[PDB]
Amino acid sequence: GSSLSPQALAQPLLLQLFVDTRPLSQHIVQRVKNILAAVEATVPISLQVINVADQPQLVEYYRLVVTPALVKIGPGSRQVLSGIDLTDQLANQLPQWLVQQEGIF
Numbered sequence: 001g002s003s004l005s006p007q008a009l010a011q012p013l014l015l016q017l018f019v020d021t022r023p024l025s026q027h028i029v030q031r032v033k034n035i036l037a038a039v040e041a042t043v044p045i046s047l048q049v050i051n052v053a054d055q056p057q058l059v060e061y062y063r064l065v066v067t068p069a070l071v072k073i074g075p076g077s078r079q080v081l082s083g084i085d086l087t088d089q090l091a092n093q094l095p096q097w098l099v100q101q102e103g104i105f
Helices: 023-036 057-061 086-099
Strands: 013-019 045-051 069-074 079-082
Touching: 013 023, 023 045, 023 086, 069 086, 079 086
Parallel strands: 013 045
Antiparallel strands: 013 069, 069 079
């Protein structure tokens, strides 16, 4: 009936990067991790890399077709960043993820 210690804490940010194991992606990976690490915060982000070479099925699921690519799953809205612009777009999307402001009260 009543709750004593309700559970509902925010979970870390889920971030995934799709790469074909090419150094360029590893290159971007450092930039990806380096940027995310440039904010940490109370809501840390977990970066998981998926080898599109081993599993092209989820790539199509995300309508993903270009690599390297970076996709945010949440919590929150889902986004797909790709075209070696991951760092530019990521840096642009990250603030928005934290800010989440559509305007001023």
